[PDB]
Enzyme design. Structure first.
Site, short mmCIF file in Angstrom:
data_model
loop_
_atom_site.label_atom_id
_atom_site.label_comp_id
_atom_site.label_asym_id
_atom_site.label_seq_id
_atom_site.Cartn_x
_atom_site.Cartn_y
_atom_site.Cartn_z
N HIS B 75 -28.21 -0.06 37.46
CA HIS B 75 -28.61 0.74 36.27
C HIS B 75 -28.39 2.23 36.49
O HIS B 75 -29.33 3.01 36.66
CB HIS B 75 -30.05 0.44 35.86
CG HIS B 75 -30.25 -0.96 35.42
ND1 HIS B 75 -30.77 -1.93 36.25
CD2 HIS B 75 -29.96 -1.59 34.25
CE1 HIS B 75 -30.81 -3.09 35.60
NE2 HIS B 75 -30.33 -2.90 34.38
N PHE B 77 -25.21 5.71 36.11
CA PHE B 77 -24.38 6.35 35.11
C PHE B 77 -23.12 5.52 34.76
O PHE B 77 -22.68 5.52 33.61
CB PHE B 77 -24.00 7.77 35.52
CG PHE B 77 -23.07 8.43 34.55
CD1 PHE B 77 -23.51 8.72 33.27
CD2 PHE B 77 -21.75 8.67 34.88
CE1 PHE B 77 -22.64 9.29 32.35
CE2 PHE B 77 -20.88 9.23 33.97
CZ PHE B 77 -21.32 9.53 32.71
N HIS B 79 -22.87 2.27 34.55
CA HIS B 79 -23.28 1.23 33.63
C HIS B 79 -23.33 1.78 32.20
O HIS B 79 -22.86 1.13 31.25
CB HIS B 79 -24.63 0.66 34.04
CG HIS B 79 -25.24 -0.24 33.01
ND1 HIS B 79 -24.62 -1.39 32.56
CD2 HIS B 79 -26.41 -0.16 32.33
CE1 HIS B 79 -25.38 -1.97 31.65
NE2 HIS B 79 -26.48 -1.25 31.49
N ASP B 116 -30.34 3.31 29.11
CA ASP B 116 -30.99 2.99 30.40
C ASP B 116 -31.37 4.25 31.18
O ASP B 116 -31.47 4.23 32.42
CB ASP B 116 -30.09 2.10 31.29
CG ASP B 116 -30.31 0.64 31.04
OD1 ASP B 116 -31.41 0.25 30.59
OD2 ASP B 116 -29.36 -0.13 31.31
N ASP B 225 -24.31 -4.05 26.09
CA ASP B 225 -25.17 -3.84 27.26
C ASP B 225 -24.93 -4.93 28.32
O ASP B 225 -24.90 -4.64 29.52
CB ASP B 225 -26.65 -3.81 26.82
CG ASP B 225 -27.60 -3.38 27.94
OD1 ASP B 225 -27.16 -2.84 28.98
OD2 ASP B 225 -28.82 -3.56 27.76
N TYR B 247 -32.05 -6.82 41.97
CA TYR B 247 -32.94 -7.97 41.86
C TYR B 247 -33.60 -8.33 43.20
O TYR B 247 -34.80 -8.59 43.26
CB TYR B 247 -32.17 -9.19 41.34
CG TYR B 247 -31.87 -9.23 39.86
CD1 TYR B 247 -32.17 -8.16 39.02
CD2 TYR B 247 -31.28 -10.37 39.29
CE1 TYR B 247 -31.90 -8.23 37.64
CE2 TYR B 247 -31.00 -10.44 37.93
CZ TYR B 247 -31.31 -9.37 37.11
OH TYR B 247 -31.02 -9.46 35.77
N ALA B 275 -26.29 -17.10 39.49
CA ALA B 275 -26.70 -16.00 38.65
C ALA B 275 -25.96 -16.03 37.32
O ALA B 275 -26.58 -15.87 36.26
CB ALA B 275 -26.43 -14.68 39.36
N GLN B 276 -24.66 -16.29 37.37
CA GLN B 276 -23.81 -16.04 36.21
C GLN B 276 -23.61 -17.24 35.30
O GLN B 276 -23.50 -17.06 34.09
CB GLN B 276 -22.47 -15.44 36.64
CG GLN B 276 -22.58 -14.03 37.25
CD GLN B 276 -23.24 -13.01 36.31
OE1 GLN B 276 -22.57 -12.25 35.61
NE2 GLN B 276 -24.56 -12.99 36.29
#
Ligand SMILES: Nc1nc2c(ncn2[C@@H]2O[C@H](COP(=O)(O)O)[C@@H](O)[C@H]2O)c(=O)[nH]1
Ligand SMILES: CC(C)Cn1c(=O)n(C)c(=O)c2nc[nH]c21
Ligand SMILES: [Mg+2]
Ligand SMILES: [Mg+2]
Ligand SMILES: [Mn+2]
Ligand SMILES: [Mn+2]
Ligand SMILES: [Mn+2]
Ligand SMILES: [Mn+2]
EC number: 3.1.4.35
Lengths: 324, 328
Positions: B75, B77, B79, B116, B225, B247, B275-276
């Protein structure tokens, strides 16, 4: 004779009724009253509240109310004392858990914490630090709430220190919902939701009960006119003091002025007539469907207040027929 | 194919063209180059023109936005640049300038950049469980997103960064209300609620109905996002590593502080593929499918890459499982 903060048996008894004279007492005496409510409601017993922490917490709450004409510590006392009155009047302990009563009372006490004496419209229009912080979403009520839990997070003020974490979370969520519900811009939305539930009300429905608790704290917040005329009436002058301060500031800062805060338009009678007729009476009428005893004790004084202010307006208008 | 060399922050014609598409390689660029890209977007979208934005203020503003992003693994810049750049891409792909007013495009772009701001690298559940100052301040109601939006307007209230200084007050209020709605819509706690509301309007969408358009814009910012997997595999893949990094940092902290741990953040349980796969199949694909009904050009450009990533990750997992079975 006993130090003022030793409440008499007569005062303790009088405290259960909406006729209680909120003006007679200094802050130390009001704190003792609030203390007595927590003990008498069985909240100290059932939540293992440290009796000294209870006092320290009430003192700290008092310290975090500002000396505004209206939105001050005596106002939070009124709201809490009316809530306490309604518990007895409506036999709320038959219907609500002790956790719900704890939420109702603590939220009543905390609901206007650190109020600056200028409303949400002022905050939003003047782009204050509060409006910016809360993104124009009930800035004041979000703030009152944050302050409440900032106070409770100091260990010597934490009346919930002996409640398990799940209990704390449940109480926290309830208090937030209730204090947020005191934003009057939401009044018609909340009334519509309640009446919708009132089509077939279910005391074992959690959503029904959350709306009932929001209506009770709203009732208590705006309840000054339920009280005897001699107790009610000075509150109106206090409110208009804040309104006129705000609108003066708005004028000199170049911001919009609400007509209901306009010194040249507004009087006590004009402020109260519409408010009693179109906000207070209708809300108390709907509550009276669940609690019939509310009609005699709370709706009757409102009818009497309405009629008195209509008489007053008639003489205020005549007096101005003499003035140009 | 120019005649001399130019400072990096002077974008080449090639970059300017590539910037309009979702294939743009976000990793090639230093912060100063990304800032120049964002700057170009405001001029190119006609936002400087239509809102009388001082071009110097625009730069100052972008630099201050950059300063107020933290150096988090995910999270950060870069992103915000991805989300903004995907929004810019979607403006062209979906011809959004036919559907939306310039005020709306301004809201979309500015919310994307700011969404964010000053993210602490720990999610709302951490804030709430740890009873952090943010959680206490925001009363457990989308604490991060409220904070992002507050910081956005703290920056804009400094005269030197106020890109809205030449917009009348009624314009400002409209822009402000919209940005708030959009930034608050990025809280994934609200994902199913927002999707349900949108699907409900979709039964009979109306571009002249303001409530419909608000929900569309909410869906658009949400899309952008979480759009990393729409990007080419080589661009998308290193972002998964960044996210797990945040995470695992959080779950490590929660294990240490004795707070609840979410299995999807647990380094003992999570893979890149793990995860994906679910996120692509059950969050991303369905959301982009709803958008495709209004903008059928989205299928080729954004769903096709998601199908490919889904399939690639399902193969990676199948291989990971064959390895585990071989050992265990
Ligand atoms: N006109 C009028 N407004 C009231 C009266 N009592 C409360 N209110 C309004 O209702 C609001 C309740 O919100 P709170 O007191 O919690 O800020 C007050 O701020 C005030 O604006 C009243 O007796 N007359
Ligand atoms: C869906 C959620 C539980 C986890 N989650 C998420 O919120 N975002 C934004 C992602 O990109 C993502 N990728 C995998 N899981 C994810
Ligand atoms: Mg209030
Ligand atoms: Mg976010
Ligand atoms: Mn004080
Ligand atoms: Mn109040
Ligand atoms: Mn920084
Ligand atoms: Mn984001």
């Amino acid at each position: 004779t006993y130090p003022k903060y030793l409440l008499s048996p007569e005062t303790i008894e009088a405290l259960r009724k909406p006729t209680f004279d909120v003006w007679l007492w200094e802050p130390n005496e009001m704190l003792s009253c609030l203390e007595h409510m927590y003990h008498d409601l069985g909240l100290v017993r059932d939540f293992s509240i440290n009796p000294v922490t209870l006092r320290r917490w009430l003192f700290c709450v008092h310290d975090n109310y500002r000396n505004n004409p209206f939105h001050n510590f005596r106002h939070c006392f009124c709201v809490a004392q009316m809530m306490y009155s309604m518990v007895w009047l409506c036999s709320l302990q038959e219907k609500f858990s002790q956790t719900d009563i704890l939420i109702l009372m603590t939220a009543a006490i905390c609901h206007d914490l650190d109020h600056p004496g200028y409303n949400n419209t002022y905050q939003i229009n003047a782009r204050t630090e509060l409006a910016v912080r809360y993104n124009d979403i009930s800035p004041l009520e979000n703030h009152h709430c944050a302050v409440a839990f900032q106070i409770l997070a100091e260990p010597e003020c934490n009346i919930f220190s002996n409640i398990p974490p799940d209990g704390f979370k449940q109480i926290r969520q309830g208090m937030i919902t209730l204090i947020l519900a005191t934003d009057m811009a939401r009044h018609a939305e909340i009334m519509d939701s309640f009446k919708e539930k009132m089509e077939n009300f279910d005391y074992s429905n959690e959503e029904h009960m959350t709306l009932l608790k929001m209506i009770l704290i709203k009732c208590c917040d705006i309840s000054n006119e339920v009280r005897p005329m001699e107790v009610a009436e000075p509150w109106v002058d206090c409110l208009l003091e804040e309104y006129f301060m705000q609108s003066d500031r708005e004028k000199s800062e170049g911001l919009p002025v609400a007509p209901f805060m306009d010194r040249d338009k507004v009087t006590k009678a004009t402020a109260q007539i519409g408010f009693i007729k179109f906000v207070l009476i209708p809300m108390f009428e709907t509550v009276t469907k669940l609690f019939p005893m509310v009609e005699e004790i709370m709706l009757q004084p409102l009818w009497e207040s309405r009629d008195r202010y209509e008489e007053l307006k008639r003489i205020d208008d005549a007096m101005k027929e003499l003035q140009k």
